[PDB]
Amino acid sequence: RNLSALKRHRQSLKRRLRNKAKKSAIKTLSKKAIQLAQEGKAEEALKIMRKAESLIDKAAKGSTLHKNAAARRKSRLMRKVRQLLEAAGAPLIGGGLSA
Amino acid sequence: MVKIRLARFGSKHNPHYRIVVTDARRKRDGKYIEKIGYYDPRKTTPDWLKVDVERARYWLSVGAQPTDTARRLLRQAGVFRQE
Amino acid sequence: PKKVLTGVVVSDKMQKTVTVLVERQFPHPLYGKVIKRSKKYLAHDPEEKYKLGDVVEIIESRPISKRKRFRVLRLVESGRMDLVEKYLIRRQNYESLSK
Amino acid sequence: GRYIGPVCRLCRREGVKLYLKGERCYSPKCAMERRPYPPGQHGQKRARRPSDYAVRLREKQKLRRIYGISERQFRNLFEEASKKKGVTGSVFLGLLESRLDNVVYRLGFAVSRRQARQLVRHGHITVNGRRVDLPSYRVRPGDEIAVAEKSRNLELIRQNLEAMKGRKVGPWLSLDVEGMKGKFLRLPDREDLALPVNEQLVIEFYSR
RNA sequence: UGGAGAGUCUGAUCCUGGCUCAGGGUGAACGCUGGCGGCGUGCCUAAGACAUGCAAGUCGUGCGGGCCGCGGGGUUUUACUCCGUGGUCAGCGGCGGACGGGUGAGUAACGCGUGGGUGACCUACCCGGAAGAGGGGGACAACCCGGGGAAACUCGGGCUAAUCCCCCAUGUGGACCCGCCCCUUGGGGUGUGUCCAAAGGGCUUUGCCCGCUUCCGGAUGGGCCCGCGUCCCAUCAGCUAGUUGGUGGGGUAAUGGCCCACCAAGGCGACGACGGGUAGCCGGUCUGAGAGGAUGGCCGGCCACAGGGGCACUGAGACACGGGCCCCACUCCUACGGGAGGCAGCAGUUAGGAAUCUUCCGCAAUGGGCGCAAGCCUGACGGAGCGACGCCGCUUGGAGGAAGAAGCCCUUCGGGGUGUAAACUCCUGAACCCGGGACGAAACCCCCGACGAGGGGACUGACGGUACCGGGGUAAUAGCGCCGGCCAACUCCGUGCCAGCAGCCGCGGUAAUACGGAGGGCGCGAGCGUUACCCGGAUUCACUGGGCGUAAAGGGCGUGUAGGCGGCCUGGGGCGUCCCAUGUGAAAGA
Numbered sequence A: 001r002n003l004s005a006l007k008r009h010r011q012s013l014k015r016r017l018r019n020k021a022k023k024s025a026i027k028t029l030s031k032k033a034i035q036l037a038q039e040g041k042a043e044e045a046l047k048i049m050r051k052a053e054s055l056i057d058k059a060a061k062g063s064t065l066h067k068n069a070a071a072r073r074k075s076r077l078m079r080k081v082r083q084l085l086e087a088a089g090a091p092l093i094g095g096g097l098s099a
Numbered sequence B: 001m002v003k004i005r006l007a008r009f010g011s012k013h014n015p016h017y018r019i020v021v022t023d024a025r026r027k028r029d030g031k032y033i034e035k036i037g038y039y040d041p042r043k044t045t046p047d048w049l050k051v052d053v054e055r056a057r058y059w060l061s062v063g064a065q066p067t068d069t070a071r072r073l074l075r076q077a078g079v080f081r082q083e
Numbered sequence C: 001p002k003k004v005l006t007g008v009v010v011s012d013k014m015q016k017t018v019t020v021l022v023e024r025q026f027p028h029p030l031y032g033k034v035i036k037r038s039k040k041y042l043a044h045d046p047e048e049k050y051k052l053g054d055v056v057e058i059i060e061s062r063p064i065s066k067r068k069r070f071r072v073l074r075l076v077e078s079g080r081m082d083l084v085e086k087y088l089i090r091r092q093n094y095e096s097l098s099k
Numbered sequence D: 001g002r003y004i005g006p007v008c009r010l011c012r013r014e015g016v017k018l019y020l021k022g023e024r025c026y027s028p029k030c031a032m033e034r035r036p037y038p039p040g041q042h043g044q045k046r047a048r049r050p051s052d053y054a055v056r057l058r059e060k061q062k063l064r065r066i067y068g069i070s071e072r073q074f075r076n077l078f079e080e081a082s083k084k085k086g087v088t089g090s091v092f093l094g095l096l097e098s099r100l101d102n103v104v105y106r107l108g109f110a111v112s113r114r115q116a117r118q119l120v121r122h123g124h125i126t127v128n129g130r131r132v133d134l135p136s137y138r139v140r141p142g143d144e145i146a147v148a149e150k151s152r153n154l155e156l157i158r159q160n161l162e163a164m165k166g167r168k169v170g171p172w173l174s175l176d177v178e179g180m181k182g183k184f185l186r187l188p189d190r191e192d193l194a195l196p197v198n199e200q201l202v203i204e205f206y207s208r
Numbered sequence E: 001u002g003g004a005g006a007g008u009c010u011g012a013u014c015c016u017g018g019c020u021c022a023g024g025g026u027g028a029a030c031g032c033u034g035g036c037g038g039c040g041u042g043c044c045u046a047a048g049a050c051a052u053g054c055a056a057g058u059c060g061u062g063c064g065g066g067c068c069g070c071g072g073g074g075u076u077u078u079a080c081u082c083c084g085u086g087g088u089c090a091g092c093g094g095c096g097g098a099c100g101g102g103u104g105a106g107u108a109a110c111g112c113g114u115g116g117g118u119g120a121c122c123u124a125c126c127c128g129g130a131a132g133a134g135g136g137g138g139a140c141a142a143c144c145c146g147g148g149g150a151a152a153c154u155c156g157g158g159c160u161a162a163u164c165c166c167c168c169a170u171g172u173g174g175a176c177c178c179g180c181c182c183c184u185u186g187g188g189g190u191g192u193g194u195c196c197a198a199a200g201g202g203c204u205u206u207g208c209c210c211g212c213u214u215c216c217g218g219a220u221g222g223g224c225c226c227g228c229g230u231c232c233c234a235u236c237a238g239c240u241a242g243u244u245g246g247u248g249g250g251g252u253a254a255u256g257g258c259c260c261a262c263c264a265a266g267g268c269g270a271c272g273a274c275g276g277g278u279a280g281c282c283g284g285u286c287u288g289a290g291a292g293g294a295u296g297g298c299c300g301g302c303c304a305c306a307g308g309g310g311c312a313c314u315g316a317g318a319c320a321c322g323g324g325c326c327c328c329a330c331u332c333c334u335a336c337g338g339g340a341g342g343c344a345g346c347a348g349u350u351a352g353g354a355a356u357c358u359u360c361c362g363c364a365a366u367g368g369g370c371g372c373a374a375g376c377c378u379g380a381c382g383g384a385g386c387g388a389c390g391c392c393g394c395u396u397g398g399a400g401g402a403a404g405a406a407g408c409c410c411u412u413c414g415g416g417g418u419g420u421a422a423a424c425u426c427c428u429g430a431a432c433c434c435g436g437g438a439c440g441a442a443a444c445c446c447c448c449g450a451c452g453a454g455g456g457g458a459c460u461g462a463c464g465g466u467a468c469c470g471g472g473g474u475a476a477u478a479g480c481g482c483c484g485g486c487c488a489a490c491u492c493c494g495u496g497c498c499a500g501c502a503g504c505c506g507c508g509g510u511a512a513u514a515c516g517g518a519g520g521g522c523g524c525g526a527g528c529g530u531u532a533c534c535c536g537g538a539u540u541c542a543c544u545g546g547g548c549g550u551a552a553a554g555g556g557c558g559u560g561u562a563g564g565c566g567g568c569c570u571g572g573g574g575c576g577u578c579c580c581a582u583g584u585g586a587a588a589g590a
C-alpha cells in the first residue's frame, strides 16, 4: 500500500485551481468587454479587450490554453467587439483592432 | 522519441537480434519502422553483423537515438567513421 | 485522391442539401454474374443550384454535418426524371408487402 | 527406439530375403532357407488372394523394414520427397540411401543395418573429421565418412574391413580400406539400387 | 506437382437417398503404459471471489528543512552562534506513472481489414535551423504552534527556498481583427494596430556541460472523415424527434446535431431499414486437387475493458488496471459517528470444471523509466521448475547361435507353431563415476585525442559447473490397440437370445475366426487407444459441381409491378472487361 503517486494527485489539485482561476478571469473580462461594445462605449470596450487579450495569451504561456485554443477566444472576441461596435461605430481607442 | 535498438528474434539460448528503427514506446519485439541489420552475439556464422550504414546514417539525421549496444555495433560498421 | 462519384439527385426537399443516388457495377464474388448495387449520398448544395433529375458528380469533402461528407462538383447531365421515376416506383412498392 | 527383436522372422513375412541379419542371411541358416513361408501357426496354410490394399501395405513394410526405421521417420521422409522437384519415387530412395547408418552399412563398415546403427550411435563414425553419432544424419554428396582413429584398433572394425578387401562398392560410393575412410559421391539412382521393392506401390499406398 | 473409395433397403437388379467408416487436425481431456534430452506449450469453464509477497519509479547537477552523529571556528570560561561533512526521513519542484503486462466481457460498429482525405488537426522527449534570457514582486508545503477524531485522517495560526507562481521590459518571431496579393474550403505572404517570451544548476568557474524561452522545419506517434468488404433469423417490415437539414452560437488540437437556440419537414428501408440472436477483428491457422468450409489459442497489428454504472481533474497525451470524485453489490476495520479495499500484472489459494504449472533464480544479457554521471527501479524480459500436451532426435543391444532345448499352443498323433527368438560365445558401452570446462560479453566507464572520428585500456553472469570435450565403464524400460466385412492379421477351449460385443451392416438361442481367455498373428511403438470438436470423403447447398414425368421437388391458373435478360447495321463515349508502368500488399508464417 501507500504509493507516492499520490504526490501527483496532490499537485493535480494545485494546478486545478490555477487553471480554473485564470479561466474565470478570461470569461469575466470578455463578457465585460462585449457588454460595453453592445453598449456603444468604444474606448472602454477597447481598453478592456486589450487586457482580455493579454490575459488570454498569458494563459496559453502555461498548460491551460496552450494550443490554438487561445487563438479561438482571441478571434471570437475581436470579431464580436468590432461587430457590436457597429452601432454608431466611432472606434475611439482603436488600440486593439486594425485600421 | 524514435530510437535505434535491438529486437530478439532467436530461440531459447540461441539469440539473434534485428537492429531496428522503432518508437521507444512499442514493444522490444513489436512493430518497428525499418529493419536496418542483424546481430548474432554468439558469432556462429562468418557474417554475424550487417548494417547498411547509409540507411543508419539517415535515421541519425532525423533524430533517432541508438542504444549503447546499438551505437557500439554501429561504430563497428563505421557509421561514425568520418575520414 | 478524394473519392469522386457520379449519380442522380432524387431529393430536393432539404435545405442546401440534395440526395444523390450512385449506382455501382461489379461481379459477384462467387457466382460471378454482374450485379448492380446502389447507395444514396447526402450532398452539400450551398447555392441550391442542382434540381431533381440532375446527374451530378459528387466528391469526398470535409464533413458538413452528420451524414453529409460530400459536395456537388459539377452538373454532368441535366433533367432525366426517368432515373428518378425508377427510384420513386421502387420506394412506392414498399407500401405493399406489409400485412 | 526402432524395432528390436527377431529379424529373420521378417525375412519370412515379406517373402523376400532381408539382409538385416548381416551374415547368416547369406549362409543357409537365414530361415529364408527351407522356410520361406510366413511365421505363425497359419504360416503353412494357403494364403488368400491379397486385397488391392493388402499388396500396397506389404510393399511399404518390405521397404521400411529393410532400412530399420520407425514409421514416424519413414512417413516424414516421404512427405519430404513429394514436395521436392523430381520423381517422388526415386527421390525417396536416394533420401533413404543418404541415412548415415545406411551409408555405414553400404560402405561395408558394418555387416548389417542394425550393426551400422550401433556404430554410429556410439560415435565410432567420423563425418568430415567430426564425430556424428546420429543414425538419422543425412549425408550430402562429397562428405567423407571415416572411422574414428579411437576405434581403428577395435577388432570388430578390422574384422569387417578384412573381408572388404577386394570387395567392390556401389558406383555412388568409394572407400579407402587401410585408412578406414569413405566418401559419398552422389545420390544413387533407381538403377543403382537392387532393392526388391516397387516404389509406385508405396506411393500408391500413401494416396489414401 | 494435383482429384482412390467402401458397407448398408432386394430373393436378386439398377437408380435415388440418408447414415456410417478409412484420412488429417487440436490450448485438448480420459484409460492403460511410460526411459533420456532439445525446442515449443500449458484456466477453452466463473470477466467468479481472492490470503501473502513482489509487479513504477527516479533525480541532492532544481530548493529549503526535521531527526541522530562527527570535525573546525568567534569566547579566558559559559551561554549563544558561524562553517564543513556523514547517515536518514519525507516535503516543495521536474520527468515518468497514457509505455510496458493482462483479459475477450461489451461491441454487427468506420470496431476491424483495405485503399484514400485532412484546405479540419495535435504530437512530450529526439534531430536541423534562426533568435533571446533584462529587472522586480509573491505564496504553499516541510518545519513550528493549537484543536477535533477510535481510526482514516482533518481543521485553524505563523516563518521559508527554488528550475513553484505573478508583473514590467526586450519582439528574432508568433498569435488575433481588418485590408491587399497569390492560392483555392481554415494554404502561403504582406501592411497597420493590439497581445505574447524565459530559470537556473554544475564544475577541470573566462569557458564549457545539463537545462530554460519564442518561432520554422524533420522524424515518430496519434485524432477525425471517406470508398469498399465484414455471421444467422423475414415466424423481425416498416424505423426515426436531435430524427433529417438549415442559420447562428457553444465546445474541441480539429470537421461535425458533438451539444444549444431558432427555422424548414425532412432522413432510413426488400440492394434487409428497425428488432432479435450470436461474436472482438485481422495477419494467419486447419482442411481441401481446387473453389471452398472451418477457426482466430500461442506470436505480431488494431480495438475494447479493469467488480457493475456514471463523471470529470491533472497533462503533449487518460476520462486513466496498480490516479480522483459519486451511486450500487460484495469483503474487512468500527469506539456505530465513520472509514479501508478492488490480481482480466507475476506466482499462489478457492470455487466451478473432463481439464490447465512454481507463492522459483536473476539485472548477466535485451528493452523501457529517471539521472551529467555513478547508479536506481523493471514478475517487460532472460532463464530454471513441473505436465509425453505437441514436435523432433535417442536408448532398452550388435554379431555368431540347433533342419532347431524347456514351457505354453495347435495336431490327421507322423508332426506343425512361438523361432535365431532364448540359453550360451564374442564385441560395443544408455546410465553412472573422475578431471577440464564455455560461447551468449561489449559497450556504459576510465585514459590518450577536443567529452568528436579514431585508438588504447578496465569491471561486468541467472542459466551453471549447465552445455561441450577428454578418461573410465555396466547388456541395460515395452507398451497399447486390433485380427466377421470396410481393413492388415486364425486357430483351440469356455459360454448357449445367457454373460456380453457393437462406428455402420451385425454377432451369441450348442463346432461362434464377431462374446470371454489362451497360443499365434497384424499395426504403431514412449507411446497406444478412446471420447468430444473442425475439415475431409460429401459432386449430400452442386461457382468450379446437382436436380424436380413416376425417386425429395413446377406454384391451381392468369395478369402485371420491381428486378433479371436483350435481333440486325453504323458512330461517339470508354462504366463493366482486357493490357502496360507504378505505389501498396509491415514483420513472422507459407
Ligand SMILES: [Mg+2]
Residues within 6 Å of the ligand: A004, A007
Ligand atoms: Mg514524484
Ligand SMILES: [Mg+2]
Residues within 6 Å of the ligand: A024, A028
Ligand atoms: Mg464570474
Ligand SMILES: [Mg+2]
Residues within 6 Å of the ligand: A063, A064
Ligand atoms: Mg488540457
Ligand SMILES: [Mg+2]
Residues within 6 Å of the ligand: B025, B026, E221
Ligand atoms: Mg504506440
Ligand SMILES: [Mg+2]
Residues within 6 Å of the ligand: B057, B060, B079, B080
Ligand atoms: Mg554521421
Ligand SMILES: [Mg+2]
Residues within 6 Å of the ligand: B082, B083
Ligand atoms: Mg580525411
Ligand SMILES: [Mg+2]
Residues within 6 Å of the ligand: B082, B083
Ligand atoms: Mg576530415
Ligand SMILES: [Mg+2]
Residues within 6 Å of the ligand: C012, C013, C014, C015, C016, C017, C048
Ligand atoms: Mg432544395
Ligand SMILES: [Mg+2]
Residues within 6 Å of the ligand: C064, C065
Ligand atoms: Mg451545418
Ligand SMILES: [Mg+2]
Residues within 6 Å of the ligand: C071, C072, C073
Ligand atoms: Mg466546388
Ligand SMILES: [Mg+2]
Residues within 6 Å of the ligand: C094, C095
Ligand atoms: Mg411508408
Ligand SMILES: [Mg+2]
Residues within 6 Å of the ligand: D082, D083
Ligand atoms: Mg502431397
Ligand SMILES: [Mg+2]
Residues within 6 Å of the ligand: none
Ligand atoms: Mg516451381
Ligand SMILES: [Mg+2]
Residues within 6 Å of the ligand: D081, D082, D083, D084, D085, D086, D087, D088, D089, D091
Ligand atoms: Mg516429388
Ligand SMILES: [Mg+2]
Residues within 6 Å of the ligand: D171, D172, D185, D186, D187, D188, D189
Ligand atoms: Mg552416382
Ligand SMILES: [Mg+2]
Residues within 6 Å of the ligand: D206, D207, D208
Ligand atoms: Mg493426398
